Amino acid sequence: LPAPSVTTGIVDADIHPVPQDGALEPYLDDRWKKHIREYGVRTTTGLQFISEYPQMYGGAMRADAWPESGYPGSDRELLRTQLLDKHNIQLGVLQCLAPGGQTLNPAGQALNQELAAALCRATNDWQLEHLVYPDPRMRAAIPVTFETPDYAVAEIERVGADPGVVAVLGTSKTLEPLGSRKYWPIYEASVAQNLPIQFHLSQGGGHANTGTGWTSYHTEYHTGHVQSFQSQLLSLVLSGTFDRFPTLKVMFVEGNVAHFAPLIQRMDYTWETLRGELPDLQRKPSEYIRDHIWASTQPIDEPEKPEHLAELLEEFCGDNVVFATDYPHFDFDDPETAFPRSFPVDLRDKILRGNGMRFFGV
Amino acid sequence: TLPAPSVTTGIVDADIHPVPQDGALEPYLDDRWKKHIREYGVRTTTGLQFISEYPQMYGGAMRADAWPESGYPGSDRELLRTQLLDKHNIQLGVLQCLAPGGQTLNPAGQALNQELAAALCRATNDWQLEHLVYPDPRMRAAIPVTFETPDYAVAEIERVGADPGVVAVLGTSKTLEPLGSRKYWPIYEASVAQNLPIQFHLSQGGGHANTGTGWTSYHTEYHTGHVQSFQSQLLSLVLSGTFDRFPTLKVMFVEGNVAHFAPLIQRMDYTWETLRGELPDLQRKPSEYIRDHIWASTQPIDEPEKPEHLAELLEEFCGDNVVFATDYPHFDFDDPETAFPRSFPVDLRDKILRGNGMRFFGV
Amino acid sequence: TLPAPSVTTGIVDADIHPVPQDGALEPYLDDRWKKHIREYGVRTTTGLQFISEYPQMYGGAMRADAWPESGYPGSDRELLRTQLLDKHNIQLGVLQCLAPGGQTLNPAGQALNQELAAALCRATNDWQLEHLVYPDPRMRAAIPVTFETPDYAVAEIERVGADPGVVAVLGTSKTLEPLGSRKYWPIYEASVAQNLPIQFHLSQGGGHANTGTGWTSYHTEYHTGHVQSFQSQLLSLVLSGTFDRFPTLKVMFVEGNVAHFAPLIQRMDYTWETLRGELPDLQRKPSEYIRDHIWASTQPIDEPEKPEHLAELLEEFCGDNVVFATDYPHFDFDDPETAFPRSFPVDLRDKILRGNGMRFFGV
Amino acid sequence: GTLPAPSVTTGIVDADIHPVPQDGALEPYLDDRWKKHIREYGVRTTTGLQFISEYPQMYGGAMRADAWPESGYPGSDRELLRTQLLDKHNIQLGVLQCLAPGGQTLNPAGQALNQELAAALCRATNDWQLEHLVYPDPRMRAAIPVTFETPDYAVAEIERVGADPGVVAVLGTSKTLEPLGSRKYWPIYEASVAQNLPIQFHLSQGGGHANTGTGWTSYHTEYHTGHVQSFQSQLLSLVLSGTFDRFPTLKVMFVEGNVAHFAPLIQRMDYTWETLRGELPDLQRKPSEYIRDHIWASTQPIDEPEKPEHLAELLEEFCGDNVVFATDYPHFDFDDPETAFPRSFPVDLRDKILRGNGMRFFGV
Ligand SMILES: [Fe+3]
Ligand SMILES: [Fe+3]
Ligand SMILES: [Fe+3]
Ligand SMILES: [Fe+3]
Ligand SMILES: [Fe+3]
Ligand SMILES: [Fe+3]
Ligand SMILES: [Fe+3]
Ligand SMILES: [Fe+3]
Ligand SMILES: [Mg+2]
Ligand SMILES: [Mg+2]
Ligand SMILES: [Mg+2]
Ligand SMILES: [Mg+2]
Ligand SMILES: [Mg+2]
Ligand SMILES: [Mg+2]
Ligand SMILES: [Mg+2]
């Protein structure tokens, strides 16, 4: 399969396909089909069929993205024409967030981690056969079980070298902050395959959705997603994970972008005083961003004064911001209208093209 | 070379708590970590500089008669020798060091800086061997290791686990993942490789609340609540199939009480009869794992209203797998002369005091 | 430090048979074993001084055109380079040394003196690395070890298994116990620890007759009969749950043919659907182990009467787990230019020549 | 458990007694999965036969016709074993060798091809014989069957119960898949020596090979006389492999392999070694020099030469200190201590066969 080529089209770092009903069954062992029929996929809830914050308005999907039968993102033809052709996407990165007709219930978060591994492997076989190889404008970010590194390492070794794969896919929420040594074998395996890692917004993880209680209303739930990414960035940087893995690239997907700038600013300021706690950390904290931390754009930040967007994106790192649409979610961003009227044209071009080309090794 | 432990006329005491005198760990700690501790203390799963989330009540939870001239109970090796080892003819006394200093329960392995945790575990292990075990090998060490960082724990088990002064690996009852999780399997593998069993002692911390349904308020809730963590760990270790992967691993629950395990296991089997289809990989019936894999120490002894129920429940658990402990110098210390009810059978009392622990510890 | 293998424009050849020149192993053998060989030869499971129980037919079963100026086919590294590596652009060629001298098939690991066998395996490994691999690292070694004495095999895997010139551990298709037996588990453990897969090459010997129902008479029976041992080994490795214990272990059956594995596995599943209750601990359906654990090399390529059936059966086995081999310099050598039928799909052949072997060897 | 060491006073040693569990007596000691497995499959071994071994017994199961209790198989009634054997012959150390999990003569637990089942049956047998027989009447002591063909499981069982004072030996079979000097078995020898336990190898069928080195026998004379051959082969391997150089305190007894034939076997071994010893240059002693410290043999079924004086000659040519009395109760060729030896047999040799020799083997 040839390497991805981006020339006059664009990069889209976050696309959500969904398998049609039964589409994963050719790839699952018999024991897991039986298990799912009898138990469903238990996770960090007391609920049979939904997550703890079920989608609010029409499944949080584009009203115009429902096909003849099935869920938005389950129709390959509609995805080719409504997304890939429409916006001339030449590298579109698939992030499968659910094994079935659902918006968000990640395979890696099944509490039966052997089932989780089986669902991740089936998703990877499915997306490569059903989407990537038939139309290699798409490439896969492969879900793995971050909470069981041995299984994730196995899956990265199995398919990580496939030219259809461009990243390893995790979740924004975890049981330990991602700088923990628990996850280091996954980083090691990813670097060995020259794969970057994308962490997509998730529920679950094992803790409440904030550091100070479970949220009540939808504003709190959705705005609160940024908090997990703030916590993860701090851990990955301050733990020295990037001293251990100096080539490891990480992208935060659907965590927003602008907030990272003042977070990193406060991180440096605090470190100037308190650095003595972490004497093995080799660089000033913000010095890790350019080489290690990326963010995708959707849902685009919308300051009251539009000029503040480019300022904050550059205060984060202008080279490390990568366009995404989030097709087919309701807060989908269109490359023709996402950026504010006065946004600098050269920054926009690299967000659409060069920045993601660098992140994915194009 | 230190001789193997020998139990002839004396008894096994599976849980004794020494503490290092002030400064006693400093020879075994690098200056970077000594400075760290001076500035930051041993930060753990609390917002408190020096104490844990449930500080002890009356007198530090220590026996009122166990205080040396100066220092904390358990810090004077001569007083431990005369008030405990000599007094009760303890010939295998297993040390479980629960704090790096003059405190009751602040385990080194639970420091959130896991590099500091590993350094403190290492220092504790060198200290207890040099200061207590080698001078008086009636004592032997259960070595604290960092269960939450398996690589560091494995390194420590490799470093010191084969020393004849060590008889077990020491963990905590509370953990971030239940102990049957694959996370901990490298520790089980290393322990088996060194022919060591594992003891899990009552702890605070772990990362979750002290119950599965909120943090407790009063001391009755806190102290009675320690049993709950061990119920949860037993279920995880058994149902996960950990003992199918490690068919020679022996684990003891220390200071989780004993009798409650019997009806827990009984409910486990009864539920499994219906729901076993969820866990088709598990090789044996759940209760069948107990005899070869799960031990419990006795302190604080269960005290039923009708004392005859004690022996019944210990046998319903597994009479061969119950091991005596005193918990010296804690306030609820059990004296082997007075702990057993009058009708208790001699066969069970004798193996609790000697043979059962000899089997667990490989003596 | 030897670079990792790199397969770009060329191919993987999973089975190449070099032979030491006369005396070439002597620098790597202790004088005691030199003396033993002079006085006893290499006694194995025969009553024969020099040959195995089924000696080769025409020309030693070697290619008529593979004889160097002096010595046995495979004994001249320059002819190996020009007639094999250069001729077919082999970029990962895996050496399987089947004899310590100028013979076709007399494996070191099968010497009945297992101390001698271990010394010959060690000497073969030092020799092939120094004479062949390091001078031309398109070649890499599958290291013979003594499967019938696991302690010695483990020692040799520890000694040389991490060398970058080594890509696999080498065993024999015939053994005294089926390969899923716990006897061989220490070897699987050591191989996994060195991130090494295992290749089992066609062999005579083992301790049993060459079929499960008597010794064969004619060469058709002997040579077609080699498939049988691999069928038996696959069944044991799968049904024993060896891959439940070692979930990262990869094994390749070398020169057992490929297509027959598909109906064998199909029968295994169909029988297990009824009889699975005998082995309730096996975690997966039997055929489900193939994809993650069982590979097969292609030579001598299966030749169905209707060529279309080849691709069908290779895919019914597992198309990602089939790896090219030439078997140079044996008479039934497969040329990668001609081995596959005209209509065979390019993607499947490409995987067989490149990606599949790269995955198996971790390249 | 706690139990005095055996005391042999005015009584005798009996090195081979065959008890058998009554129907169901092992079930309290077996996991549910193995009870189910046995119900559904029986105990598969190296045969194509559901219920019998490849050479089933000829006449009445090869039991003496007077040892049948009210209900069970011979050897299944503890009271009958006490009065018919231990009381009757003043046996003060009677060593139990349980050869079957049930009333089915000669079917060793260790030879089940499912070695996890085999281990479970060995463990159940050990728990049962200690509880039902040894502890109630400690004149009896156990030779604990273990799975020789799966050393990890055997080592575990030796570690589990091998230090129990009710146990006096580890119990194996005369036939194995590899000769007993093979390194495969060395972990078992290591674990046995660590528990200061000797090993007894009892006559068996099975093993994985034919019952001779040159084909399967046809008639019962060939089968029963053929049992000595396996012991000949095992002695040669154990000695010539240097197993006793590696384990210099290891003691082994061949049980029910006869005695006299060992003498000329060893004699031929030395004579051959004098020429060919260069093949095995590490061996520390002349082959026959291993016997005194390492190899014992029990007497039953006693050798019956045509001229009785040859018996004592051959027993001394083997090693007079290393011959140990056994009855083989309740099998048909049972030997009685009062009549087994020829009238002219030396009294000093007989006394040590009945007492001193076995005391030294079992560490009494
Ligand atoms: Fe998204
Ligand atoms: Fe979204
Ligand atoms: Fe305590
Ligand atoms: Fe306490
Ligand atoms: Fe070959
Ligand atoms: Fe060949
Ligand atoms: Fe007998
Ligand atoms: Fe007999
Ligand atoms: Mg600045
Ligand atoms: Mg300053
Ligand atoms: Mg540094
Ligand atoms: Mg390697
Ligand atoms: Mg198993
Ligand atoms: Mg099962
Ligand atoms: Mg003993």
Side-chain angles (χ1 to χ4, degrees), chain A residues 1-67 69-340 343-362, chain B residues 1-5 7-290 292-341 343-353 355-363, chain C residues 1-5 7-68 70-290 292-363, chain D residues 1-22 24-69 72-78 80-106 108-337 339-342 344-364:
Chain A
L1 194 63
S5 177
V6 179
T7 57
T8 65
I10 70 170
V11 175
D12 179 354
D14 190 25
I15 299 163
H16 297 303
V18 163
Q20 300 192 301
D21 290 2
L24 294 190
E25 299 196 300
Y27 308 99
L28 289 164
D29 287 353
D30 288 352
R31 177 265 186 90
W32 299 123
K33 302 177 201 179
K34 177 176 189 295
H35 186 96
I36 295 162
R37 290 189 315 260
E38 291 170 6
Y39 281 93
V41 187
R42 187 185 183 87
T43 186
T44 41
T45 71
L47 297 166
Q48 184 71 18
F49 292 114
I50 63 169
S51 71
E52 59 268 28
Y53 294 105
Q55 285 66 52
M56 253 303 261
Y57 298 113
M61 293 291 186
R62 270 173 58 169
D64 74 336
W66 292 81
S69 151
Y71 214 61
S74 69
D75 186 318
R76 161 175 48 186
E77 191 54 7
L78 184 55
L79 190 141
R80 172 198 209 104
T81 67
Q82 196 174 49
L83 175 67
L84 296 183
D85 291 352
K86 170 56 60 184
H87 300 292
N88 195 15
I89 288 159
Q90 289 174 327
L91 173 55
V93 184
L94 303 178
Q95 300 194 29
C96 184
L97 305 176
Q102 190 102 150
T103 305
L104 175 79
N105 205 302
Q109 293 189 324
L111 276 175
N112 184 322
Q113 284 282 284
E114 290 73 44
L115 172 63
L119 288 168
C120 286
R121 185 186 183 165
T123 300
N124 294 330
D125 291 337
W126 163 83
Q127 71 182 317
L128 289 174
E129 197 181 344
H130 187 71
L131 294 166
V132 171
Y133 271 71
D135 185 347
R137 287 180 299 180
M138 288 170 287
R139 300 296 163 120
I142 53 166
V144 299
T145 54
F146 271 75
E147 303 296 14
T148 309
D150 275 354
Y151 302 164
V153 169
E155 182 64 354
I156 293 166
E157 291 174 345
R158 185 188 69 97
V159 294
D162 193 299
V165 172
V166 294
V168 174
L169 178 62
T171 59
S172 67
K173 297 186 176 56
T174 55
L175 191 72
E176 297 179 55
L178 279 164
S180 166
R181 191 181 179 93
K182 169 172 175 170
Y183 305 112
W184 287 20
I186 300 173
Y187 305 152
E188 179 175 55
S190 295
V191 164
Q193 295 282 35
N194 194 24
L195 284 174
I197 304 184
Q198 289 180 290
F199 295 102
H200 191 280
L201 173 160
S202 72
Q203 298 181 28
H207 307 281
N209 66 326
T210 84
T212 184
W214 295 93
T215 59
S216 286
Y217 293 95
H218 215 60
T219 38
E220 296 177 73
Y221 157 71
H222 197 166
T223 311
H225 275 306
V226 305
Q227 292 166 37
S228 311
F229 290 98
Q230 295 177 359
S231 309
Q232 299 293 21
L233 182 153
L234 296 177
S235 170
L236 283 159
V237 168
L238 295 172
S239 64
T241 291
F242 304 122
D243 291 339
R244 173 66 183 80
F245 297 109
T247 72
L248 175 68
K249 297 185 173 72
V250 169
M251 181 187 292
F252 297 126
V253 179
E254 213 159 325
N256 280 64
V257 185
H259 69 104
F260 287 130
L263 177 68
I264 290 158
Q265 195 173 291
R266 172 175 168 85
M267 178 176 58
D268 273 0
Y269 182 100
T270 306
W271 170 93
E272 293 283 356
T273 303
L274 291 170
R275 54 193 294 178
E277 197 188 2
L278 304 179
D280 294 323
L281 189 65
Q282 291 179 324
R283 310 171 74 186
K284 185 169 67 172
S286 59
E287 288 166 359
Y288 292 96
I289 301 304
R290 163 204 43 188
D291 298 318
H292 301 287
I293 301 291
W294 282 252
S296 57
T297 49
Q298 184 284 341
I300 192 74
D301 291 296
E302 293 186 20
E304 200 165 51
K305 298 191 181 195
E307 68 201 71
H308 291 158
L309 180 69
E311 298 180 6
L312 279 155
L313 295 189
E314 295 279 11
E315 285 166 22
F316 167 68
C317 181
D319 288 325
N320 288 20
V321 176
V322 178
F323 183 68
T325 67
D326 206 32
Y327 184 82
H329 290 184
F330 86 94
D331 53 352
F332 164 95
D333 278 340
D334 188 319
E336 296 298 297
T337 65
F339 298 92
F343 194 84
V345 290
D346 289 352
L347 182 56
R348 176 173 179 279
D349 173 75
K350 65 186 184 173
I351 292 175
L352 290 170
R353 290 180 188 91
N355 287 356
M357 289 164 70
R358 172 167 163 259
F359 177 81
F360 293 111
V362 182
Chain B
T1 289
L2 197 70
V7 185
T8 72
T9 58
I11 65 172
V12 177
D13 180 354
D15 191 29
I16 299 166
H17 299 305
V19 309
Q21 288 177 331
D22 290 350
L25 295 191
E26 293 175 14
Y28 311 105
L29 285 168
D30 98 8
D31 276 289
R32 176 268 188 89
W33 295 123
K34 287 183 293 206
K35 173 159 109 76
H36 192 101
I37 291 159
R38 289 196 255 106
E39 299 179 342
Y40 287 96
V42 185
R43 188 169 179 281
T44 184
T45 45
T46 71
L48 301 166
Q49 185 73 6
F50 295 117
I51 68 172
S52 72
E53 62 268 29
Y54 295 102
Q56 293 67 46
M57 293 263 283
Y58 323 108
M62 297 291 185
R63 275 172 55 164
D65 66 350
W67 291 76
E69 174 155 17
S70 57
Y72 215 65
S75 72
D76 186 305
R77 65 186 176 182
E78 281 324 294
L79 185 54
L80 190 144
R81 212 185 276 352
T82 69
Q83 196 166 58
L84 175 70
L85 302 181
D86 292 350
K87 187 169 168 53
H88 299 290
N89 193 23
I90 290 163
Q91 291 175 339
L92 174 56
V94 184
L95 304 174
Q96 304 196 22
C97 183
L98 303 175
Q103 299 186 279
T104 297
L105 177 61
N106 309 76
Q110 293 188 320
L112 278 175
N113 179 322
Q114 284 283 286
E115 292 70 43
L116 171 69
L120 281 171
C121 287
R122 186 176 188 287
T124 296
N125 287 329
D126 289 348
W127 161 80
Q128 66 182 322
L129 294 174
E130 183 281 341
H131 186 74
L132 295 168
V133 170
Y134 275 75
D136 188 346
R138 292 182 291 178
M139 286 173 290
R140 300 293 166 123
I143 53 164
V145 301
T146 56
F147 270 75
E148 304 295 10
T149 307
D151 276 357
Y152 298 169
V154 166
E156 184 63 358
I157 293 167
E158 292 172 349
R159 186 187 72 94
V160 78
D163 192 295
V166 177
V167 293
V169 177
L170 180 60
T172 61
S173 67
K174 296 181 170 64
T175 51
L176 194 63
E177 298 179 46
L179 280 165
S181 299
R182 195 178 182 92
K183 169 165 181 173
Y184 306 110
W185 287 21
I187 300 172
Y188 303 151
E189 182 182 50
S191 299
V192 166
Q194 292 280 42
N195 193 29
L196 293 167
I198 303 181
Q199 287 179 288
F200 293 105
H201 188 281
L202 164 169
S203 78
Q204 301 181 24
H208 308 280
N210 65 329
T211 86
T213 183
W215 295 93
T216 61
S217 283
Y218 293 94
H219 230 74
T220 40
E221 294 174 74
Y222 156 75
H223 195 167
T224 312
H226 275 302
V227 172
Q228 292 163 37
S229 311
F230 286 105
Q231 299 177 354
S232 311
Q233 298 291 23
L234 183 152
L235 297 176
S236 174
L237 280 162
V238 171
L239 292 172
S240 62
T242 289
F243 302 119
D244 292 340
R245 171 66 179 81
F246 301 106
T248 77
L249 179 66
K250 295 188 176 68
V251 302
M252 179 184 295
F253 297 128
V254 176
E255 210 158 332
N257 281 65
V258 185
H260 71 102
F261 288 128
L264 176 67
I265 292 161
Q266 194 178 294
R267 174 176 170 81
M268 181 173 56
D269 268 7
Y270 180 101
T271 310
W272 173 89
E273 294 280 1
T274 303
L275 292 169
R276 54 193 293 185
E278 194 187 6
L279 298 178
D281 301 345
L282 186 64
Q283 296 189 5
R284 314 171 74 185
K285 184 169 63 180
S287 66
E288 292 172 340
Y289 290 94
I290 302 303
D292 302 316
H293 301 287
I294 298 287
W295 278 256
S297 60
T298 52
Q299 182 283 339
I301 192 91
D302 293 294
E303 293 182 18
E305 187 150 80
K306 292 189 176 189
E308 74 208 64
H309 293 157
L310 181 61
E312 295 175 10
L313 278 153
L314 300 185
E315 296 275 13
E316 287 170 18
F317 163 65
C318 187
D320 289 330
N321 286 24
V322 178
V323 178
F324 185 71
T326 67
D327 208 32
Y328 181 87
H330 293 182
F331 83 95
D332 56 352
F333 171 88
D334 277 339
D335 183 330
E337 182 190 26
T338 62
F340 297 97
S343 65
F344 201 91
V346 289
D347 172 60
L348 189 54
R349 171 264 193 206
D350 287 349
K351 57 195 184 172
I352 289 176
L353 286 174
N356 289 351
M358 294 174 62
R359 170 161 149 266
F360 180 78
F361 291 113
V363 177
Chain C
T1 291
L2 196 64
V7 182
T8 49
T9 63
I11 64 169
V12 178
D13 180 355
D15 192 27
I16 301 170
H17 297 304
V19 153
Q21 293 179 324
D22 292 352
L25 297 188
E26 285 171 13
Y28 308 109
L29 280 173
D30 189 273
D31 285 340
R32 182 231 177 124
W33 299 119
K34 295 185 184 87
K35 176 184 192 285
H36 193 98
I37 294 163
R38 289 196 308 272
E39 294 173 353
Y40 286 90
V42 190
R43 182 188 180 86
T44 184
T45 44
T46 72
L48 298 167
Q49 180 71 13
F50 296 115
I51 65 169
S52 69
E53 62 269 26
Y54 295 102
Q56 293 69 45
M57 304 252 84
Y58 327 103
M62 297 294 188
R63 272 175 57 171
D65 67 350
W67 291 78
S70 68
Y72 216 65
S75 70
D76 186 303
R77 63 177 178 191
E78 320 305 336
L79 183 55
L80 262 161
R81 176 172 74 63
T82 63
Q83 204 167 45
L84 177 67
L85 304 178
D86 291 351
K87 186 155 161 210
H88 301 290
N89 197 19
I90 290 161
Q91 288 171 335
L92 172 57
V94 180
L95 304 175
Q96 303 198 24
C97 184
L98 300 179
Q103 304 163 97
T104 301
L105 176 62
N106 310 78
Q110 292 189 321
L112 277 170
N113 181 322
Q114 282 285 284
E115 291 69 46
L116 172 65
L120 281 170
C121 284
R122 170 173 175 151
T124 297
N125 293 330
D126 288 346
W127 161 79
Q128 67 185 321
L129 290 174
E130 178 153 7
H131 189 66
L132 292 170
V133 170
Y134 273 75
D136 189 344
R138 292 179 297 173
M139 289 177 288
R140 302 287 164 122
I143 53 168
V145 304
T146 55
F147 270 78
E148 304 293 14
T149 309
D151 276 356
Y152 300 168
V154 169
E156 182 63 2
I157 291 165
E158 288 168 351
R159 185 186 72 91
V160 75
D163 191 298
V166 174
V167 296
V169 176
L170 178 60
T172 59
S173 70
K174 294 184 173 63
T175 50
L176 192 72
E177 308 186 35
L179 281 162
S181 300
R182 195 180 180 92
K183 171 173 177 173
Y184 306 111
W185 286 23
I187 303 173
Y188 305 149
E189 183 178 49
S191 298
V192 165
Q194 290 282 42
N195 197 16
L196 289 172
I198 303 172
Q199 293 178 289
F200 297 101
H201 188 283
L202 167 167
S203 75
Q204 293 179 33
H208 306 282
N210 68 323
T211 85
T213 183
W215 295 91
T216 62
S217 284
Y218 294 95
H219 234 256
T220 40
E221 299 175 70
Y222 157 73
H223 196 170
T224 312
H226 274 307
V227 156
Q228 289 162 43
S229 314
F230 287 104
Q231 298 179 352
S232 308
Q233 295 293 25
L234 184 151
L235 299 175
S236 171
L237 278 162
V238 170
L239 298 170
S240 67
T242 292
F243 302 122
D244 290 340
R245 171 65 181 81
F246 303 104
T248 73
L249 178 66
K250 297 190 175 70
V251 308
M252 180 186 296
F253 298 131
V254 178
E255 210 161 328
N257 281 65
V258 189
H260 72 100
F261 284 130
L264 173 72
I265 289 157
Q266 191 176 295
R267 171 178 170 83
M268 182 172 58
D269 273 6
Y270 180 100
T271 310
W272 168 97
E273 290 284 355
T274 300
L275 290 173
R276 58 195 292 181
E278 195 186 4
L279 300 171
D281 298 334
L282 187 67
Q283 295 182 5
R284 318 172 76 174
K285 182 170 64 179
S287 67
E288 292 169 349
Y289 290 92
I290 301 306
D292 297 319
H293 300 287
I294 302 285
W295 279 253
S297 60
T298 50
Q299 185 280 343
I301 190 86
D302 290 296
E303 293 186 34
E305 184 157 74
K306 294 195 177 184
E308 73 207 69
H309 291 157
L310 179 65
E312 290 178 20
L313 280 157
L314 299 183
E315 293 273 14
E316 285 170 19
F317 166 64
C318 179
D320 294 329
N321 287 21
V322 175
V323 178
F324 184 71
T326 64
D327 206 34
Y328 181 87
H330 293 184
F331 82 99
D332 57 349
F333 168 92
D334 279 335
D335 189 327
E337 300 190 356
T338 62
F340 295 82
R342 289 343 187 267
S343 68
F344 202 86
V346 291
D347 174 71
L348 183 54
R349 197 188 58 185
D350 181 68
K351 294 200 293 190
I352 293 173
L353 292 166
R354 292 191 308 131
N356 288 356
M358 294 166 65
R359 160 102 185 99
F360 176 81
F361 295 113
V363 172
Chain D
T2 176
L3 210 50
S7 206
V8 175
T9 191
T10 47
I12 61 165
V13 171
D14 181 353
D16 188 24
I17 302 171
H18 299 301
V20 149
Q22 299 185 302
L26 292 189
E27 301 190 306
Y29 305 104
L30 285 167
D31 283 353
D32 286 347
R33 66 211 174 103
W34 299 122
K35 299 174 204 181
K36 185 180 180 293
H37 182 93
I38 291 166
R39 289 194 304 267
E40 294 171 6
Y41 282 91
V43 184
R44 185 188 182 82
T45 185
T46 44
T47 70
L49 300 164
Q50 182 72 16
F51 291 118
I52 62 166
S53 69
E54 61 269 27
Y55 294 102
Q57 288 68 48
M58 273 286 284
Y59 304 123
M63 302 292 209
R64 35 187 277 202
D66 69 319
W68 291 82
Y73 210 58
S76 70
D77 190 313
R78 108 245 266 214
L80 188 61
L81 200 146
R82 257 205 326 269
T83 74
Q84 220 167 47
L85 176 71
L86 301 175
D87 294 356
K88 186 158 295 180
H89 300 290
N90 194 18
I91 289 157
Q92 270 146 13
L93 173 54
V95 183
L96 306 176
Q97 300 195 29
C98 187
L99 299 184
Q104 11 130 290
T105 295
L106 199 54
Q111 291 191 326
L113 275 173
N114 183 322
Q115 284 283 285
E116 292 70 40
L117 172 64
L121 287 170
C122 284
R123 170 174 185 159
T125 299
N126 290 331
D127 287 343
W128 161 80
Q129 69 181 323
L130 294 171
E131 187 286 335
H132 188 71
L133 293 170
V134 170
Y135 272 80
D137 187 348
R139 296 181 292 177
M140 290 175 284
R141 299 292 164 115
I144 53 168
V146 302
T147 56
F148 271 77
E149 302 295 14
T150 310
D152 279 348
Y153 300 166
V155 168
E157 183 62 0
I158 292 164
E159 291 175 352
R160 187 186 72 88
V161 292
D164 191 288
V167 174
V168 295
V170 176
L171 177 60
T173 60
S174 65
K175 294 185 175 61
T176 52
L177 193 73
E178 303 186 47
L180 279 163
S182 168
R183 190 179 181 95
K184 171 175 184 177
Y185 308 109
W186 284 18
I188 299 174
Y189 304 151
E190 186 174 52
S192 297
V193 161
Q195 300 282 35
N196 194 20
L197 283 174
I199 307 182
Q200 290 179 289
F201 295 104
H202 190 283
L203 178 161
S204 77
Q205 295 183 26
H209 306 282
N211 66 325
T212 85
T214 186
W216 295 92
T217 60
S218 282
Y219 292 98
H220 221 247
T221 41
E222 297 175 72
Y223 157 77
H224 198 166
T225 311
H227 276 301
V228 304
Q229 292 168 32
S230 308
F231 287 101
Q232 295 177 355
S233 305
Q234 297 292 23
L235 185 154
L236 299 177
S237 169
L238 280 161
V239 171
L240 295 167
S241 65
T243 293
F244 304 120
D245 285 351
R246 170 64 181 85
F247 300 107
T249 72
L250 178 69
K251 297 181 177 81
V252 168
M253 182 189 292
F254 297 127
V255 180
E256 211 157 326
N258 284 65
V259 186
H261 71 101
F262 287 131
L265 175 71
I266 294 162
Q267 192 176 295
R268 170 173 170 82
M269 177 175 54
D270 271 5
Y271 182 98
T272 307
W273 170 93
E274 291 282 0
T275 297
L276 291 170
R277 57 182 311 231
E279 197 185 5
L280 297 177
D282 290 332
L283 200 60
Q284 289 172 27
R285 316 172 77 175
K286 182 163 62 165
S288 62
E289 290 168 355
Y290 289 96
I291 304 309
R292 174 201 75 201
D293 295 327
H294 302 287
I295 303 275
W296 279 254
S298 53
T299 51
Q300 188 283 340
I302 190 82
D303 290 296
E304 295 186 10
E306 281 233 285
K307 299 195 177 186
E309 53 264 37
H310 292 162
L311 181 63
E313 291 180 13
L314 278 155
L315 302 190
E316 300 276 16
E317 282 169 21
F318 170 63
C319 184
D321 289 334
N322 285 28
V323 176
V324 178
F325 181 73
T327 65
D328 205 29
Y329 179 84
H331 292 183
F332 87 99
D333 52 354
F334 161 91
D335 276 341
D336 192 317
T339 60
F341 301 93
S344 53
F345 195 79
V347 297
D348 299 293
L349 180 55
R350 173 173 174 276
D351 171 82
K352 63 183 184 175
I353 290 175
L354 296 166
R355 290 177 191 89
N357 292 352
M359 294 169 69
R360 175 178 158 246
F361 178 77
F362 293 112
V364 180

